[PDB]
Amino acid sequence: LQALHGYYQRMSADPDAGMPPYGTSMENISFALVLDAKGTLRGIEDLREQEGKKLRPRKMLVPIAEKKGNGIKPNFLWENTSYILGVDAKGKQERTDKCHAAFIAHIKAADQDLAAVLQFLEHGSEEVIGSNIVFRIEGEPGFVHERPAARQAWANCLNRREQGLCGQCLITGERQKPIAQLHPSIKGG
DNA sequence: CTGGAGGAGTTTTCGCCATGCTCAGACTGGCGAGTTCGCG
């Protein structure tokens, strides 16, 4: 319904409304890793919160996630242990190894922070297993994915992907627009 | 006779909580008036 499109367009114009900016979404995160600028990991930040009933993760604004079928798709900068640590509980190690290789490969598409995290990837409690994690530089505010250079790289990747076929958009009625081969998912439960 | 493969059919991965009472009376109030038949 175009009503939702109009509502988003209007309310996103308000800076404090809470609309995620284009290309970003709010997800669940449990821990953050701290590593020095030299590429050595030391320090883990656990952001999970006790909701009275249970200890549950926290909501964070991050780059949108792919819709993972049976195929392997690497997320940009935040992932679970299987892609990052090359470890899991699924037993099928080769799958995890392939995921890790794809994850490291996607990064290469000059910043010292990404240089450091690349350096750490030369090697890459139990509760971290299976949870979502993010990266932070030792004593650095914010997170690596928040740095402007990361945003430029993300925009470049988006431009890379949005190419080829073009047509008429039914919601807007405009011509020669790139057509979406797949739609992002919607939260259930 | 063997190949490459397009299509048909089967398997894997995906991610993974909640809803909260209740409580009480009235009221007291009077209808109506009436007429029967009659030889052999």
Automatic annotation (TrEMBL):
> Organism's domain of life?
Bacteria
Under what name is this protein listed?
CRISPR-associated protein, CT1133 family
Which organism's genome codes for this protein? Nitratidesulfovibrio vulgaris (strain ATCC 29579 / DSM 644 / CCUG 34227 / NCIMB 8303 / VKM B-1760 / Hildenborough) (Desulfovibrio vulgaris)
The top of its lineage is: Bacteria, Pseudomonadati, Thermodesulfobacteriota, Desulfovibrionia, Desulfovibrionales
Q: Which residues of the full protein are shown?
A: 3 to 204 of 612
